[PDB]
Short mmCIF file of C-alpha atoms and ligand atoms in Angstrom, two decimals:
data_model
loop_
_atom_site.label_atom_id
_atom_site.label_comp_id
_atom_site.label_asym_id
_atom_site.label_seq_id
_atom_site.Cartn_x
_atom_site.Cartn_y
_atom_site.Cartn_z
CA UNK O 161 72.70 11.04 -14.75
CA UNK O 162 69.53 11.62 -12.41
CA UNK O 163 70.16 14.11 -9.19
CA UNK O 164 67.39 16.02 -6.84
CA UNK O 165 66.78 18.83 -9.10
CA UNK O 166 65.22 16.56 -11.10
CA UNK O 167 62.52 15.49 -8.56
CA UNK O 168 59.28 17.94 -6.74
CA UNK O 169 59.21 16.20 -3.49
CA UNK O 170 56.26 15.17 -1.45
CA UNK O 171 54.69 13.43 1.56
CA UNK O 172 56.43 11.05 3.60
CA UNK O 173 56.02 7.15 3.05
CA UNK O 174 57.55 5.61 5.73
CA UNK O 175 60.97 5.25 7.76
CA UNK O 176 63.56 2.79 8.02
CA UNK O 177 66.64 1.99 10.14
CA UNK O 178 68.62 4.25 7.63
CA UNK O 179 66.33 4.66 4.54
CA UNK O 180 63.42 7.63 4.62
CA UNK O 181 61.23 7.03 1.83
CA UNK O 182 59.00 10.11 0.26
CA UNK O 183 56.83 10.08 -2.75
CA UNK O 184 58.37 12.13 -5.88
CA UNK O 185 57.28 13.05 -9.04
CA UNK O 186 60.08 13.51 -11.96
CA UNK O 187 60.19 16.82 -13.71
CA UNK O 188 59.90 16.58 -17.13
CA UNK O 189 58.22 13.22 -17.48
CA UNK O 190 55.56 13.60 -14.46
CA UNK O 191 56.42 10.01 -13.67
CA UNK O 192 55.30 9.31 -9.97
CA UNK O 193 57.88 7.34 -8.01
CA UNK O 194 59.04 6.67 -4.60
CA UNK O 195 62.67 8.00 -3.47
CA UNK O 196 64.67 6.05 -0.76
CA UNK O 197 67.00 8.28 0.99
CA UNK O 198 70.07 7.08 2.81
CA UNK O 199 72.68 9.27 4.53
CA UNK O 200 75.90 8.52 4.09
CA UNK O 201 77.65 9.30 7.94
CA UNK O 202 75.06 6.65 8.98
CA UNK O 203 75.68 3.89 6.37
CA UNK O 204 79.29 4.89 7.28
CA UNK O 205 79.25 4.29 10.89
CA UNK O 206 77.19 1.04 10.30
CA UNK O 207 79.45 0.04 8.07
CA UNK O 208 77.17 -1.40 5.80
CA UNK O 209 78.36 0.01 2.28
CA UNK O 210 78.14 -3.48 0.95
CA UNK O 211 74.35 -4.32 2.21
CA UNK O 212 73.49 -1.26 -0.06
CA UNK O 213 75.24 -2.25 -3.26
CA UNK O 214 73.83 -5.40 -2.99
CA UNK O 215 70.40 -3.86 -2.76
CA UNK O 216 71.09 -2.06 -5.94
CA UNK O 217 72.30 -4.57 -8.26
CA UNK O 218 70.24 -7.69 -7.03
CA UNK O 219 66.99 -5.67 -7.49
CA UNK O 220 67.40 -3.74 -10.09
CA UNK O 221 68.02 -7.03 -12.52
CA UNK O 222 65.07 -9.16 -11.29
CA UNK O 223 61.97 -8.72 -13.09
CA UNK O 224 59.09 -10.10 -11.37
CA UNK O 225 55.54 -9.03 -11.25
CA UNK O 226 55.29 -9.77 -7.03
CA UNK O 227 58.95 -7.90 -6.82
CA UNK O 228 59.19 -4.12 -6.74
CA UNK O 229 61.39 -2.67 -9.45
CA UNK O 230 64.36 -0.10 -8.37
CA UNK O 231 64.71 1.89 -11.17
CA UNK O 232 68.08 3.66 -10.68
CA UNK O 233 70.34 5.74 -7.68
CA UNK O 234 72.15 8.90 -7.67
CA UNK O 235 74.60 10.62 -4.21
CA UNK O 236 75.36 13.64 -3.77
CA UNK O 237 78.01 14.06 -0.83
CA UNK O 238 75.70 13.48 2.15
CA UNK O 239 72.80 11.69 1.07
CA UNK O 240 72.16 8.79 -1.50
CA UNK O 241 68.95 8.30 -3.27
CA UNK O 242 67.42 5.32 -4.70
CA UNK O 243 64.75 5.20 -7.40
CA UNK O 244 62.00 3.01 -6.73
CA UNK O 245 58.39 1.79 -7.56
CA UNK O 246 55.74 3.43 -6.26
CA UNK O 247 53.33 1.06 -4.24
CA UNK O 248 49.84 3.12 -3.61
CA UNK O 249 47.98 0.33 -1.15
CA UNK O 250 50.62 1.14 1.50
CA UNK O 251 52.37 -2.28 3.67
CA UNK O 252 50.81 -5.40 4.55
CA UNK O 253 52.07 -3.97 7.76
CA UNK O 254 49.76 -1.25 8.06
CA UNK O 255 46.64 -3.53 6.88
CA UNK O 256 47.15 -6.05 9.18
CA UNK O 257 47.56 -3.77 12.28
CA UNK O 258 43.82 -2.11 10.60
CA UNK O 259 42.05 -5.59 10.48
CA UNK O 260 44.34 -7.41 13.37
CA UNK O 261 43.84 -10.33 11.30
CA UNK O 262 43.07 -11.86 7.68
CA UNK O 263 40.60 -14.63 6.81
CA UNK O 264 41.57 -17.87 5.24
CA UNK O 265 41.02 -16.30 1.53
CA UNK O 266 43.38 -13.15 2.20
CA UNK O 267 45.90 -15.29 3.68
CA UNK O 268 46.02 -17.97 1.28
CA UNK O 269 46.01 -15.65 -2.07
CA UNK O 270 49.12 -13.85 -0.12
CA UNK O 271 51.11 -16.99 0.45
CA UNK O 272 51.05 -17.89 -3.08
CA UNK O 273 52.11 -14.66 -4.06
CA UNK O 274 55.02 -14.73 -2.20
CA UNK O 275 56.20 -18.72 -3.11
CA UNK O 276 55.28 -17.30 -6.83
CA UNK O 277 58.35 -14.33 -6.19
CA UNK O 278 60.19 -16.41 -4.08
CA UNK O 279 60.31 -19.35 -6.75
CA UNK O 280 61.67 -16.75 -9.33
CA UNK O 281 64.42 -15.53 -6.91
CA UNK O 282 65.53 -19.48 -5.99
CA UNK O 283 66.06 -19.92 -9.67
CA UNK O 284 68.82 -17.24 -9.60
CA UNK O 285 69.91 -18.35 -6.02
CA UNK O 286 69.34 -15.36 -4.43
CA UNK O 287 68.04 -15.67 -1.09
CA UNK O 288 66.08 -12.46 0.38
CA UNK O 289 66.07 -13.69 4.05
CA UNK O 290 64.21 -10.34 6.03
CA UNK O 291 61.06 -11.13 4.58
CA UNK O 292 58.32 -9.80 7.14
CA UNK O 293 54.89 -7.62 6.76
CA UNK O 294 56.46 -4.05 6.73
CA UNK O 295 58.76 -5.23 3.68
CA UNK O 296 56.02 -6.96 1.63
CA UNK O 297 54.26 -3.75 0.01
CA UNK O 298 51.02 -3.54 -2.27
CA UNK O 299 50.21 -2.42 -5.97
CA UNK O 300 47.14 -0.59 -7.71
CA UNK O 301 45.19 -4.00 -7.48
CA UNK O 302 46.21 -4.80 -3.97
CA UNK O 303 48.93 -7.33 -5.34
CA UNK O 304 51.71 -8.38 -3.35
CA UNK O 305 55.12 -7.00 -3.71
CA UNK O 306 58.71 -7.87 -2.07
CA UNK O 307 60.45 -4.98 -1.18
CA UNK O 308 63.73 -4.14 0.93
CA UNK O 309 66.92 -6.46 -0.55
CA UNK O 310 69.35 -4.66 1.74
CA UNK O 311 70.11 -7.99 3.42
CA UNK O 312 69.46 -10.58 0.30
CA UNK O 313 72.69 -12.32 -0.99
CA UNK O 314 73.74 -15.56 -2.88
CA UNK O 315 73.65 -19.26 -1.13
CA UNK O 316 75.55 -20.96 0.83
CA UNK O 317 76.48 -18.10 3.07
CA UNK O 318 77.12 -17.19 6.78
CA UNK O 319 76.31 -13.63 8.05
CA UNK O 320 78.93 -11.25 8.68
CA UNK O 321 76.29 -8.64 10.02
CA UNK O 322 75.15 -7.95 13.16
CA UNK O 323 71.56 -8.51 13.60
CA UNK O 324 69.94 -5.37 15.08
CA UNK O 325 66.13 -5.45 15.59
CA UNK O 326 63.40 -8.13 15.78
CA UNK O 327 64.43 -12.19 15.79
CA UNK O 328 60.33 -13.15 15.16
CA UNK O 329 61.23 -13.86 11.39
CA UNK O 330 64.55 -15.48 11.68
CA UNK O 331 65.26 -18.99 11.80
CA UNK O 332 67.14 -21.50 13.79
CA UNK O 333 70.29 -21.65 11.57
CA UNK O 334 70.58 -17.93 11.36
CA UNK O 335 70.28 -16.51 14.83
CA UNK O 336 72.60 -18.92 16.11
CA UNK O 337 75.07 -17.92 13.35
CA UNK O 338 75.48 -21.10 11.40
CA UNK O 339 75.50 -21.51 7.68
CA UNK O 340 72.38 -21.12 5.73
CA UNK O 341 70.69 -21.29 2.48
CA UNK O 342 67.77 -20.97 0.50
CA UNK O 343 65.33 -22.95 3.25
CA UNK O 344 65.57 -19.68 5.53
CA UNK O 345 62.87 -18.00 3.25
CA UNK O 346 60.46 -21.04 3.79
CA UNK O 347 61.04 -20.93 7.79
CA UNK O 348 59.89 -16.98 7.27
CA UNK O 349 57.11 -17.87 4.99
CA UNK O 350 55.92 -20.57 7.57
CA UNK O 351 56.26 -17.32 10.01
CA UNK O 352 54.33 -15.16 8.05
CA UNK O 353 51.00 -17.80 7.20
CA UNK O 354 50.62 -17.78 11.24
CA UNK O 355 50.91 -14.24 11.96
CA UNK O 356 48.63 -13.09 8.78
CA UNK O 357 45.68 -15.90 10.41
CA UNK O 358 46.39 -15.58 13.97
CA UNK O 359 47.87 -11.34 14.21
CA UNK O 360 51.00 -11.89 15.98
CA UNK O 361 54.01 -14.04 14.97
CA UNK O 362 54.43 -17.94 16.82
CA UNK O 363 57.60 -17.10 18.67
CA UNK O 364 57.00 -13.63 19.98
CA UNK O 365 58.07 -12.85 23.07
CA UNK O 366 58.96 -10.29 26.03
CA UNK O 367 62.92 -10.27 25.32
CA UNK O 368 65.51 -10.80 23.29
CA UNK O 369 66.33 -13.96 25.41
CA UNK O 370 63.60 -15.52 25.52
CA UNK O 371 62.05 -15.03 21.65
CA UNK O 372 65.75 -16.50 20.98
CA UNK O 373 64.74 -19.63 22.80
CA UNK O 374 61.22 -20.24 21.38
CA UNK O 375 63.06 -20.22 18.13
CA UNK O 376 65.91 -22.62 18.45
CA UNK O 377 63.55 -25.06 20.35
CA UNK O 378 60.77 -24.53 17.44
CA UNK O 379 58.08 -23.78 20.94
CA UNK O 380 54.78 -22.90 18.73
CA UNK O 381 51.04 -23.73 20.09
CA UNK O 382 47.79 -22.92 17.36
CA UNK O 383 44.52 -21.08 18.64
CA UNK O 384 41.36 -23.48 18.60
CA UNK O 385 40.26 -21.10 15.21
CA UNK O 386 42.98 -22.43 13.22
CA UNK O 387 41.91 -24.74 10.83
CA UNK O 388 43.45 -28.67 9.95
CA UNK O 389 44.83 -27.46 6.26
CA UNK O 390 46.28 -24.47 7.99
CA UNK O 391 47.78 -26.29 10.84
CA UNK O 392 49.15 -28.84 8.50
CA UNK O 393 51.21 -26.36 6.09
CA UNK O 394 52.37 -24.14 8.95
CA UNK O 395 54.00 -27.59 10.54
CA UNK O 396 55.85 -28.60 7.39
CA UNK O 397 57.30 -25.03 7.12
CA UNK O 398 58.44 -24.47 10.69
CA UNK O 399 60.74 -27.61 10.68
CA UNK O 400 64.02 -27.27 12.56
CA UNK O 401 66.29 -29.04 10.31
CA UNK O 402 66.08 -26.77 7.08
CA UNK O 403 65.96 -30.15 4.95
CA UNK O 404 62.86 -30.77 6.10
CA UNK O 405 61.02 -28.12 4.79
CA UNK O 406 58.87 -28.50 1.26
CA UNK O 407 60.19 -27.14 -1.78
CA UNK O 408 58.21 -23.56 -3.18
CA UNK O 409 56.09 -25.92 -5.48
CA UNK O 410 54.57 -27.75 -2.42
CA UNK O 411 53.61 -25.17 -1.00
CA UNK O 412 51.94 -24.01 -4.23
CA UNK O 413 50.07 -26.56 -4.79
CA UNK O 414 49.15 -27.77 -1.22
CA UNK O 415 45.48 -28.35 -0.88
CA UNK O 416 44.81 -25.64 1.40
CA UNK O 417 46.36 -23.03 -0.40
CA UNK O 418 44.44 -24.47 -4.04
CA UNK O 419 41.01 -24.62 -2.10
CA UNK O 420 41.54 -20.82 -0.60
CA UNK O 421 43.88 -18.99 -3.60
CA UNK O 422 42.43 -16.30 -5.47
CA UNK O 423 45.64 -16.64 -7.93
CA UNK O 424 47.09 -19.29 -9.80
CA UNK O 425 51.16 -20.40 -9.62
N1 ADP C 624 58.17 1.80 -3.05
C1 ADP C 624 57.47 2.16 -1.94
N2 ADP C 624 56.19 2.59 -2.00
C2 ADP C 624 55.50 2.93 -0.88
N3 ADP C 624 56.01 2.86 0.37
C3 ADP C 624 57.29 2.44 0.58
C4 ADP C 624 58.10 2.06 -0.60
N4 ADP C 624 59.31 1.67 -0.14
C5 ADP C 624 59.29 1.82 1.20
N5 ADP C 624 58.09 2.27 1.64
C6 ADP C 624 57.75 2.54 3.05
O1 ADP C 624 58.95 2.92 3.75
C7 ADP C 624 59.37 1.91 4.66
C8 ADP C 624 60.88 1.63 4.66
O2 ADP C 624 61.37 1.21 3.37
P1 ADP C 624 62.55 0.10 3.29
O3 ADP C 624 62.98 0.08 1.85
O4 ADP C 624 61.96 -1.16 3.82
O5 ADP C 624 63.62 0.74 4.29
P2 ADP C 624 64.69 0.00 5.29
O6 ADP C 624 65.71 -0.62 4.37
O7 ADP C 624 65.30 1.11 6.10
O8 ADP C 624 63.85 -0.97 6.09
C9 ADP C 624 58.58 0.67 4.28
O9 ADP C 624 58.40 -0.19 5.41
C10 ADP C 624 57.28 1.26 3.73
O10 ADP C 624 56.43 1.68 4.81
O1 A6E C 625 79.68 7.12 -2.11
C1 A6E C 625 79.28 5.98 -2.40
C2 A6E C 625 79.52 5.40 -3.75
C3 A6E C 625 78.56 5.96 -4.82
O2 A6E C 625 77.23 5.56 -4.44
C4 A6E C 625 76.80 4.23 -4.72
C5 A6E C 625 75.58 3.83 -4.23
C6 A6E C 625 75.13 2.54 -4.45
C7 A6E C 625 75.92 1.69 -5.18
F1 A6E C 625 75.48 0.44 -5.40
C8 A6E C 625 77.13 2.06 -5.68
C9 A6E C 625 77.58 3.35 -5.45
N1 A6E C 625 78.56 5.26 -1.52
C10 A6E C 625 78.08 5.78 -0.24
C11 A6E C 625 78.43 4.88 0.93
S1 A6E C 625 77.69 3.25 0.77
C12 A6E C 625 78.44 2.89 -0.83
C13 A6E C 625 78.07 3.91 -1.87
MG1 MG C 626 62.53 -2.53 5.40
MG1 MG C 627 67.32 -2.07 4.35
#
């Protein structure tokens, strides 16, 4: 159906591991979009055909307002394209390296974004697990968005992939390469509500090694800023046992996050 001379190109987005993402406008309908590209020796070599199909048809049949909508793809021999959402207000990334960190409003209205799209994705059992700032992406009224399913499957699982960048999201279960399920998207979220009130993530480290043994041993300390409500949903989240850990609607409706939410569940 759709194939580049359909699309006027523009300026860069961002970058990715194998995905370069530009902003595009369609031809004939002037519909403004953003175009993931992916070449094909690389996905090849990485052998990770089956991350990207799963990317396609996981996302492109949830319908969420916090989850960004992929539209379509289309290949043409060395290259292939996906068709997604256009988010104007840029990463949470980018804004938190621009503020360094957020206050207890930001953070809060955030969180329950993310248990609200997180909720709808249990239901189905999918599972996104690489949830972290420069995959969470923002709409026309600075709403929160998931983005990047490239490593979401369905629960139980194991991994069969080799993990190639940053460990700071990941948690016990998963780095040392036992089974998992849906409780490795409340570890992250646990991750996240530090690093958005504190500016860097509880387990970061110098190496490899070492960020690897924060994690497994759950090592964590809280700056004297951090507040009791804070403290106390953070420690729920960042159990080790993954049994532990509240369900999406405690989190929701923890007193904290009802006192400081700008959004409802
Ligand atoms: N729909 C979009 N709108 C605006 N920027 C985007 C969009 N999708 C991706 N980006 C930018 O491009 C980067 C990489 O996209 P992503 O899909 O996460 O690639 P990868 O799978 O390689 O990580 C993002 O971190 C973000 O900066
Ligand atoms: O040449 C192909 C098949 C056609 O492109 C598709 C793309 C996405 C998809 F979900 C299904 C098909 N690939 C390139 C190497 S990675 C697997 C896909
Ligand atoms: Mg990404
Ligand atoms: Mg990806």
């Amino acid at each position: 159906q759709w194939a580049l001379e359909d699309f006027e190109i523009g300026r860069p987005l961002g970058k990715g591991k194998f995905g370069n993402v530009y902003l595009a406008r369609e031809k004939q309908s002037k519909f403004i979009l953003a175009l993931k590209v992916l070449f094909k020796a690389q996905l090849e070599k990485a052998g990770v055909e089956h991350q990207l199909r799963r990317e396609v048809e996981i996302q492109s049949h949830l319908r969420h307002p916090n989850i960004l909508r992929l539209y379509g793809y289309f290949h043409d021999a060395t290259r292939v394209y996906l068709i997604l959402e256009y988010a104007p207000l840029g990463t949470v990334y980018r804004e938190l390296q621009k503020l360094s960190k957020f206050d207890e409003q930001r953070t809060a209205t955030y969180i329950t974004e993310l248990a609200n799209a997180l909720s709808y994705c249990h239901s189905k059992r999918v599972i996104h697990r690489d949830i972290k700032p420069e995959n969470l992406l923002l709409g026309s009224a600075g709403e929160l968005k998931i983005a990047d399913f490239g490593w979401s499957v369905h629960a139980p699982s194991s991994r069969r992939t080799t993990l190639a960048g940053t460990l700071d999201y990941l948690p016990p279960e998963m780095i040392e390469g036992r089974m998992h399920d849906e409780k490795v998207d409340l570890w992250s979220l646990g991750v996240l509500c530090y690093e958005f009130l504190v500016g860097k993530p509880p387990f970061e480290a110098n190496t490899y090694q070492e960020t690897y043994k924060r994690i497994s041993r759950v090592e964590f300390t809280f700056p004297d800023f951090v507040t009791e409500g804070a403290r106390d949903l953070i420690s729920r989240l960042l159990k080790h046992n993954p049994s532990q850990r509240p369900m999406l609607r405690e989190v929701l409706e923890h007193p904290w996050i009802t006192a400081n939410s700008s959004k409802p569940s």
